[PDB]
């Protein structure tokens, strides 16, 4: 099934492209380089079963960085609450959010 | 060499476009391995600073790592300036 | 009147372009077609007048029926004339296209292309010289100048 010719011969045919924490041209970092590095270092050398059981925190952080589901949920909840508040006039946005400020350079 | 010369003469009279194409391709394959400027091109590409040169923490045993850009230690592009 | 003045100037503008941008269909029969070629030749250059041959009847404004029209050819001439879009003009050249020509009393000749298509200009000769056909083209241009379509519409 999986004849590991690359590891037997010391070659490198696709392991460079396997992950986004590997050597990238001009040292361009991935979006979730730190999270992937943490998950990989947690899961290295313990097997798939133990990696799934014990590195679940790292994997969940990696998935959150990748997809941004909980972050988008929080942003949507904040947007809905703000829209409800401004519908009844309870909330008045500040000038620095309305565009009447001088931002930082 | 007579047979080769006859073949080249016939091809030049029949297919000058193909003769020129094969000659140009052969030159393009052979010449780069002999030119001394290939290493110069490699060094010029290596000397281009696309990203920031992150400094190194000085532990007191780095004699060849400069403390200032203008110090004598470090890479020099004097070879590139006159080229 | 303002309206009559506007329509008169507009009609002059429209008639000027059609007058000075004649695109005859590339269509010749028999001997009379050679005089069209000599008209297109450098000596009597038709292109300098705005007269340019085009192959497709759709992109043609004038049909020069130059040569003998036979019974076997009349349906095709009528078909190309119909497929030529309006405004369209017809110049018959030579005795064969005008009337019967040398072959008037022939079983297989149409005694006049005006039995098939409405003819605007008749050029007499056998064959008419390139100068004669150029005169016919200029006469057709002058005939175009006198058209008052917008003036007819306004007073309609």
């Amino acid at each position: 099934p999986f004849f590991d010719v690359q590891k037997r011969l010391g070659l490198d045919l696709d392991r460079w492209m396997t992950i986004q924490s590997a050597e990238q041209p001009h040292k361009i970092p991935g979006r979730c380089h730190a999270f992937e590095k943490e998950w990989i270092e947690c899961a290295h050398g313990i097997g798939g079963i133990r990696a799934e059981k014990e590195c679940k925190i790292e994997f969940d952080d990696f998935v959150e960085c990748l997809l941004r589901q909980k972050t988008m949920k929080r942003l949507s909840a904040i947007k809905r609450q703000r829209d409800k508040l401004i519908k009844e006039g309870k909330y008045t946005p500040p000038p620095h959010h309305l565009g009447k400020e001088d931002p930082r350079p | 060499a007579g047979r080769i010369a006859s073949f080249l003469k016939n091809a030049w009279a029949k297919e000058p476009v193909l003769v020129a194409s094969f000659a140009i391709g052969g030159l393009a394959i052979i010449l780069p391995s002999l030119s001394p400027y290939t290493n110069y091109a490699i060094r010029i590409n290596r000397a281009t600073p696309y990203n920031y040169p992150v400094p190194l923490r000085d532990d007191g045993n780095m004699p060849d790592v400069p403390s200032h850009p203008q110090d004598p230690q470090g890479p020099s592009l004097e070879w590139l300036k006159n080229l | 009147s303002r309206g009559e003045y506007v329509v008169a100037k507009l009609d002059d503008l429209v008639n000027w372009a059609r007058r000075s941008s004649l695109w005859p269909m590339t269509f010749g029969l028999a001997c009379c077609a050679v005089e069209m070629m000599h008209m297109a030749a450098p000596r009597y250059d038709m292109d300098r007048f705005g007269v340019v041959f085009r192959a497709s009847p759709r992109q043609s404004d004038v049909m020069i029926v130059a040569g003998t029209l036979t019974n076997k050819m009349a349906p095709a001439l009528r078909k190309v004339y119909d497929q030529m879009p309006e405004p369209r003009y017809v110049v018959s050249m030579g005795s064969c296209a005008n009337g019967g020509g040398y072959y008037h009393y022939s079983y297989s000749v149409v005694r006049g292309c005006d039995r098939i298509v409405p003819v605007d200009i008749y050029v007499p000769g056998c064959p008419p010289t390139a100068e004669a056909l150029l005169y016919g083209i200029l006469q057709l241009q002058r005939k175009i100048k006198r058209e008052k379509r917008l003036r007819i519409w306004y007073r309609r």
Partner: protein, 70 residues
């Protein structure tokens, strides 16, 4: 003779002058008398955004310097 072809070529050349000259004039007019800033990369775009922010008039071409620091 052959020089009667020139007026048509002259008119065509004059017509072809208009796009480039008009574009240059509009670039100078809408960028404060200077060349339109070319931002082919995120660094140059960030430079333009910082120029907008520091100007205080929301125009990047309005440049400030030593008289602005002090």
């Amino acid at each position: 003779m052959w020089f009667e072809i020139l007026p048509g070529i002259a008119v065509m050349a004059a017509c072809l002058f208009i796009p480039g000259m008009a574009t240059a004039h509009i670039h100078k007019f809408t960028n404060g008398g200077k060349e339109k800033r070319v931002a082919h990369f995120s660094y140059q775009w960030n430079l333009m955004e910082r120029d907008r922010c520091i100007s205080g008039v929301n125009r990047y071409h309005v440049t400030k310097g030593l008289e602005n620091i002090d």
